[PDB]
Design a protein around this motif. Sequence first.
Motif, PDB file in Angstrom:
ATOM      1  N   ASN A   6      56.109  68.202  50.986  1.00 42.64           N
ATOM      2  CA  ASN A   6      55.973  69.215  50.114  1.00 42.64           C
ATOM      3  C   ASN A   6      55.010  68.492  48.781  1.00 42.64           C
ATOM      4  O   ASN A   6      54.795  67.224  49.210  1.00 42.64           O
ATOM      5  N   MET A   7      54.647  69.209  47.994  1.00 43.38           N
ATOM      6  CA  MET A   7      54.551  68.764  47.110  1.00 43.38           C
ATOM      7  C   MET A   7      54.689  67.970  46.223  1.00 43.38           C
ATOM      8  O   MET A   7      53.954  66.660  45.897  1.00 43.38           O
ATOM      9  N   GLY A   8      56.395  67.614  45.742  1.00 44.81           N
ATOM     10  CA  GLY A   8      56.249  66.688  45.186  1.00 44.81           C
ATOM     11  C   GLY A   8      57.147  66.858  43.822  1.00 44.81           C
ATOM     12  O   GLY A   8      56.054  67.761  43.159  1.00 44.81           O
ATOM     13  N   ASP A  31      41.200  70.051  47.465  1.00 43.46           N
ATOM     14  CA  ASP A  31      42.123  71.205  48.040  1.00 43.46           C
ATOM     15  C   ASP A  31      42.876  71.714  47.835  1.00 43.46           C
ATOM     16  O   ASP A  31      42.862  72.746  47.918  1.00 43.46           O
ATOM     17  N   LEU A  32      43.002  71.643  46.367  1.00 34.57           N
ATOM     18  CA  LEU A  32      43.784  72.706  45.592  1.00 34.57           C
ATOM     19  C   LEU A  32      42.943  73.295  44.575  1.00 34.57           C
ATOM     20  O   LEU A  32      43.454  74.494  44.188  1.00 34.57           O
ATOM     21  N   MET A  33      41.975  72.664  43.990  1.00 34.11           N
ATOM     22  CA  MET A  33      40.689  72.561  43.204  1.00 34.11           C
ATOM     23  C   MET A  33      40.145  71.919  42.892  1.00 34.11           C
ATOM     24  O   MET A  33      39.933  70.621  43.775  1.00 34.11           O
ATOM     25  N   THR A  34      38.651  72.213  42.384  1.00 31.92           N
ATOM     26  CA  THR A  34      37.198  71.649  42.082  1.00 31.92           C
ATOM     27  C   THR A  34      37.218  71.413  41.006  1.00 31.92           C
ATOM     28  O   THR A  34      37.222  72.470  40.305  1.00 31.92           O
ATOM     29  N   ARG A  53      46.022  64.221  28.897  1.00 30.90           N
ATOM     30  CA  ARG A  53      45.806  65.801  27.887  1.00 30.90           C
ATOM     31  C   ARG A  53      47.464  66.596  27.908  1.00 30.90           C
ATOM     32  O   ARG A  53      47.981  67.135  26.965  1.00 30.90           O
ATOM     33  N   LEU A  54      47.737  66.922  28.957  1.00 25.23           N
ATOM     34  CA  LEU A  54      48.798  67.749  29.449  1.00 25.23           C
ATOM     35  C   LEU A  54      49.531  67.065  29.534  1.00 25.23           C
ATOM     36  O   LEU A  54      50.903  67.434  29.505  1.00 25.23           O
ATOM     37  N   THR A  55      49.913  65.816  29.913  1.00 24.03           N
ATOM     38  CA  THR A  55      51.420  64.737  29.938  1.00 24.03           C
ATOM     39  C   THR A  55      52.393  64.932  29.214  1.00 24.03           C
ATOM     40  O   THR A  55      53.768  64.773  29.868  1.00 24.03           O
ATOM     41  N   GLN A  82      57.536  72.439  54.417  1.00 21.18           N
ATOM     42  CA  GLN A  82      58.564  72.477  53.774  1.00 21.18           C
ATOM     43  C   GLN A  82      58.062  74.145  52.885  1.00 21.18           C
ATOM     44  O   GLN A  82      58.944  74.453  52.204  1.00 21.18           O
ATOM     45  N   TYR A  83      56.715  74.124  53.304  1.00 18.18           N
ATOM     46  CA  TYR A  83      56.616  75.407  52.593  1.00 18.18           C
ATOM     47  C   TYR A  83      56.322  76.582  53.662  1.00 18.18           C
ATOM     48  O   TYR A  83      56.098  76.589  54.934  1.00 18.18           O
ATOM     49  N   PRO A  84      58.117  77.715  53.780  1.00 17.44           N
ATOM     50  CA  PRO A  84      57.927  79.025  55.096  1.00 17.44           C
ATOM     51  C   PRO A  84      56.655  79.279  55.488  1.00 17.44           C
ATOM     52  O   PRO A  84      55.753  80.016  55.869  1.00 17.44           O
ATOM     53  N   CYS A 131      46.719  78.110  52.563  1.00 13.51           N
ATOM     54  CA  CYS A 131      45.794  76.347  52.584  1.00 13.51           C
ATOM     55  C   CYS A 131      45.647  75.259  51.076  1.00 13.51           C
ATOM     56  O   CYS A 131      45.441  74.426  51.313  1.00 13.51           O
ATOM     57  N   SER A 132      46.164  76.568  50.425  1.00 12.87           N
ATOM     58  CA  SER A 132      46.488  74.985  49.041  1.00 12.87           C
ATOM     59  C   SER A 132      47.729  74.093  49.477  1.00 12.87           C
ATOM     60  O   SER A 132      47.909  73.250  48.125  1.00 12.87           O
ATOM     61  N   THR A 133      48.772  74.627  49.909  1.00 13.39           N
ATOM     62  CA  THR A 133      49.975  73.434  49.739  1.00 13.39           C
ATOM     63  C   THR A 133      49.933  73.112  51.067  1.00 13.39           C
ATOM     64  O   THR A 133      49.565  72.064  51.494  1.00 13.39           O
ATOM     65  N   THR A 134      50.288  73.622  52.459  1.00  5.30           N
ATOM     66  CA  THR A 134      50.365  72.755  53.758  1.00  5.30           C
ATOM     67  C   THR A 134      48.571  72.257  54.030  1.00  5.30           C
ATOM     68  O   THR A 134      49.160  71.480  54.469  1.00  5.30           O
ATOM     69  N   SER A 173      52.132  82.203  42.342  1.00  6.21           N
ATOM     70  CA  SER A 173      50.760  83.602  42.276  1.00  6.21           C
ATOM     71  C   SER A 173      49.364  81.951  43.674  1.00  6.21           C
ATOM     72  O   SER A 173      49.917  80.866  43.448  1.00  6.21           O
ATOM     73  N   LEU A 174      48.826  83.137  43.398  1.00  8.25           N
ATOM     74  CA  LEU A 174      47.425  81.946  43.587  1.00  8.25           C
ATOM     75  C   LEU A 174      46.630  82.967  42.631  1.00  8.25           C
ATOM     76  O   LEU A 174      46.367  83.868  42.709  1.00  8.25           O
ATOM     77  N   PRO A 175      45.074  81.721  43.017  1.00  4.14           N
ATOM     78  CA  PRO A 175      43.549  82.678  42.366  1.00  4.14           C
ATOM     79  C   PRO A 175      43.424  83.987  43.184  1.00  4.14           C
ATOM     80  O   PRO A 175      43.868  83.490  43.804  1.00  4.14           O
ATOM     81  N   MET A 176      42.754  84.313  42.257  1.00  2.00           N
ATOM     82  CA  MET A 176      42.156  85.570  43.605  1.00  2.00           C
ATOM     83  C   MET A 176      40.773  85.325  44.339  1.00  2.00           C
ATOM     84  O   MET A 176      41.387  85.497  45.000  1.00  2.00           O
ATOM     85  N   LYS A 178      51.349  81.318  37.072  1.00  3.38           N
ATOM     86  CA  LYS A 178      49.719  81.150  36.923  1.00  3.38           C
ATOM     87  C   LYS A 178      49.089  80.291  35.731  1.00  3.38           C
ATOM     88  O   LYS A 178      50.048  80.427  34.968  1.00  3.38           O
ATOM     89  N   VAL A 179      48.360  79.886  35.614  1.00  2.00           N
ATOM     90  CA  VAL A 179      47.916  78.515  35.156  1.00  2.00           C
ATOM     91  C   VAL A 179      46.287  78.853  34.844  1.00  2.00           C
ATOM     92  O   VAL A 179      45.545  79.682  35.536  1.00  2.00           O
ATOM     93  N   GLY A 180      45.835  79.104  33.588  1.00  2.00           N
ATOM     94  CA  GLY A 180      44.126  79.160  33.359  1.00  2.00           C
ATOM     95  C   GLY A 180      43.416  80.632  33.209  1.00  2.00           C
ATOM     96  O   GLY A 180      44.537  81.555  33.008  1.00  2.00           O
ATOM     97  N   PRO A 181      42.413  80.828  32.838  1.00  3.22           N
ATOM     98  CA  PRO A 181      42.253  82.440  32.458  1.00  3.22           C
ATOM     99  C   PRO A 181      41.275  82.541  33.258  1.00  3.22           C
ATOM    100  O   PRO A 181      41.292  83.993  33.504  1.00  3.22           O
ATOM    101  N   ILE A 206      61.439  83.036  46.486  1.00  2.00           N
ATOM    102  CA  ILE A 206      61.037  83.473  47.910  1.00  2.00           C
ATOM    103  C   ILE A 206      59.907  82.263  48.292  1.00  2.00           C
ATOM    104  O   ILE A 206      60.018  82.474  49.988  1.00  2.00           O
ATOM    105  N   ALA A 207      59.918  81.609  47.864  1.00  2.00           N
ATOM    106  CA  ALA A 207      58.187  80.793  48.465  1.00  2.00           C
ATOM    107  C   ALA A 207      58.899  79.185  48.396  1.00  2.00           C
ATOM    108  O   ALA A 207      57.772  78.139  48.374  1.00  2.00           O
ATOM    109  N   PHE A 208      59.725  78.826  47.801  1.00  2.00           N
ATOM    110  CA  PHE A 208      60.301  77.722  47.705  1.00  2.00           C
ATOM    111  C   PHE A 208      62.080  77.213  48.259  1.00  2.00           C
ATOM    112  O   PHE A 208      62.435  77.834  48.410  1.00  2.00           O
ATOM    113  N   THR A 209      62.770  76.235  49.018  1.00  2.00           N
ATOM    114  CA  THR A 209      63.405  76.156  49.569  1.00  2.00           C
ATOM    115  C   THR A 209      64.942  74.963  48.641  1.00  2.00           C
ATOM    116  O   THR A 209      65.727  75.032  48.868  1.00  2.00           O
TER     117      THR A 209
END
Lengths: 359, 359
Positions: free
Chosen positions: B11-13, B33-36, B50-52, B126-128, B132-135, B200-203, B240-243, B271-274
């Motif tokens: 899990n991401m945690g 693997d989640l973002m560049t 900055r975001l903490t 633990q993602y049903p 590619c961004s999670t499992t 959601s996911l980025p397009m 969703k986050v970002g522009p 529906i996407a987490f337990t």
Amino acid sequence: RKPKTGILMLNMGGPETLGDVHDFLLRLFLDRDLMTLPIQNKLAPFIAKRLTPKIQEQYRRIGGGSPIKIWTSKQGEGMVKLLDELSPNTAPHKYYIGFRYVHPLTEEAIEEMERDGLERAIAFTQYPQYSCSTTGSSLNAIYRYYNQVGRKPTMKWSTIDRWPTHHLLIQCFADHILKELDHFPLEKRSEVVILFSAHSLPMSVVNRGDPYPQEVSATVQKVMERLEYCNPYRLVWQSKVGPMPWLGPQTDESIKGLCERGRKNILLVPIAFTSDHIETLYELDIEYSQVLAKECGVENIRRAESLNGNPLFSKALADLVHSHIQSNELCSKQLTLSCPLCVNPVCRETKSFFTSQQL
Amino acid sequence: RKPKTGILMLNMGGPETLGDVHDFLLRLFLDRDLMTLPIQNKLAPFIAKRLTPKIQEQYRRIGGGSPIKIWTSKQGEGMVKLLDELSPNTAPHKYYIGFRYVHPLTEEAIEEMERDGLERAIAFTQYPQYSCSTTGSSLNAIYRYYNQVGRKPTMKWSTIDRWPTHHLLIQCFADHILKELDHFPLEKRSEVVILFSAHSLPMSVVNRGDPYPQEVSATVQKVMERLEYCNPYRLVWQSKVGPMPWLGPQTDESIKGLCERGRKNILLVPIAFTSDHIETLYELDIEYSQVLAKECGVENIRRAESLNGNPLFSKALADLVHSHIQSNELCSKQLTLSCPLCVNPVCRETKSFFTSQQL
Ligand SMILES: CC(C)(C)c1ccc(-c2nc3n(n2)C(=O)CC(CNc2ccc4ccccc4n2)=N3)cc1
Ligand SMILES: CC(C)(C)c1ccc(-c2nc3n(n2)C(=O)CC(CNc2ccc4ccccc4n2)=N3)cc1
Ligand code: FES
Ligand code: FES
């Protein structure tokens, strides 16, 4: 004997001859439920004349016209024969074709149904997965016909407005997939990647809440469950036009990408329509399978046969109508919910037209 | 007795205390693997610091930290108790928690598993629904662990990499939906709209071929089949986050839009987490259900209880591991196909790490 129950088979249609192309495009670009444009009444005509040569050439490449009416008629014929035996209390049954953009138009079919003196009328969309741009547009046309003509219907209406997981629809897809899998070299059968391909939507349509992508996904899942996940698959999206964003990945880029990454044995499965038409015979078979697949160096790319004349599909249609009649349903529960960001006032009125019908 | 079979729960945690927030964000923004990101190795610490404060405040609003570890441990414990009795030949079973972005990290769990001298290791996402961004990122971390340490594993590995339609997962969702439907006023029960909500996911990720949206759609259809389509539903997307463009419609705009269109009784279904986490306790319950819902004048908005401690869910997990063991599967058939437009060289090596494992 006088026809008692009419089954209106709804489809967008396709030009049967090259001469029909212009009027087909004209009615298409005039459809505000399919797309809204700067002064529709005027910009459409221009686009229709501008694109007629290109679209005529596409239909010339697949034999000179759309086969939709032939398949719809065959399917309608087999459906009615079963229904007369399945549901004698509602017999005789008669099918009518209501194409959105070519003759016979939805409005002409309604007129004939009314002239025939039916007790019961069923709006049976031939898109298994609901989109406001396809099934929604056809149902609005039915509502608008009575509103603009200014009279009330003389028959009891109801709709079969979606059916993405009907067990016999699923069985016909799985059968056609397995049949095509057998045409691959046995040594590559397990290599084969199944690409379910469906007509895409603009992201503006997706983002307003169109139920289509989720329902297409449900169809794909049921088919692959029935095939016991024998092969890996992806769901990809075809037929995008224009410069705006559409739902991806695109079918053509996906074929290219798989080939470049060493997946050179591919089975295309058109999952969102029930007969051959321009999208399978031209876009997939010519644009993607012939040109693209050989420029990228595929080993084997095939396409599952469209449902077309399969007699099991005719039983699927008749079972759907039979169950609809026995259940006294007016519409799916899903039709009772309009899109969360719907901006079209007709969608509410169309919904209430069906939910309010006298039984 | 020495543990024989290890079940690595991936899990991401989430940060357990406010003090853990900073490092959680740092590891998140470092995950390629989640973002560049440009100059990632030092642009990530910048964004993290900055975001903490902002993220700390969100966790303070829900009690001071993430509950994921508590629920994961409860679920793992119940899974182990059933597995020891379901499958004595592979007992004793032991669960390990492998979080992507907080302690215990995926890498720390692998070290303890090796040290425990297990015969068999199961990477159990633990993602049903696979993304590619999670499992994918979690599985990549397992492959990279052995690659960077420079040795081969001392236990036989396999993965349960997705399970979007497992019948007991479906039953747990349906049970919690029905339970929550009973908490609406009886006179509004039939009027309730079910909004299934998934991250959601980025397009850009959707358009490269990520299987997540199609698999989430499948979970939705199975739940609603079990509920016999008792209520209308839509699948909508949150967080969703970002522009950049993300897959919509957005859950928040969807609630607003339904409310303004007279649908004032809404049931949210994560529906996407337990288990509960920041997405349910903060984003849905505080941002949308309390704030957004109050502004638009909703009558009743509720959220189905997260699966959390439901003993039927523990039975689902143990059933998945048991069937995975009996079947001798190394991974789903779907894992053997990388995304058609995948640009990550690690994904093929991770896939082939699992498919090549000695049985
Ligand atoms: C640039 C010019 C040339 C002016 C142009 C601009 C826009 C468009 C256009 N095309 C759309 N647009 N907009 C929509 O908004 C929605 C839509 C969905 N259509 C379906 C959806 C599912 C289907 C399943 C099975 C079979 C057919 C299906 N068709 N198609 C066409 C031309
Ligand atoms: C602006 C700044 C602050 C720089 C930022 C930019 C981008 C991002 C961002 N966030 C992403 N990005 N990019 C992805 O590309 C993919 C993704 C998927 N995440 C899931 C998918 C399914 C799930 C199911 C169940 C539970 C959790 C799930 N999470 N989330 C974060 C921050
Ligand atoms: S556009 Fe979907 S219901 Fe109006
Ligand atoms: S990103 Fe999906 S497989 Fe590489």
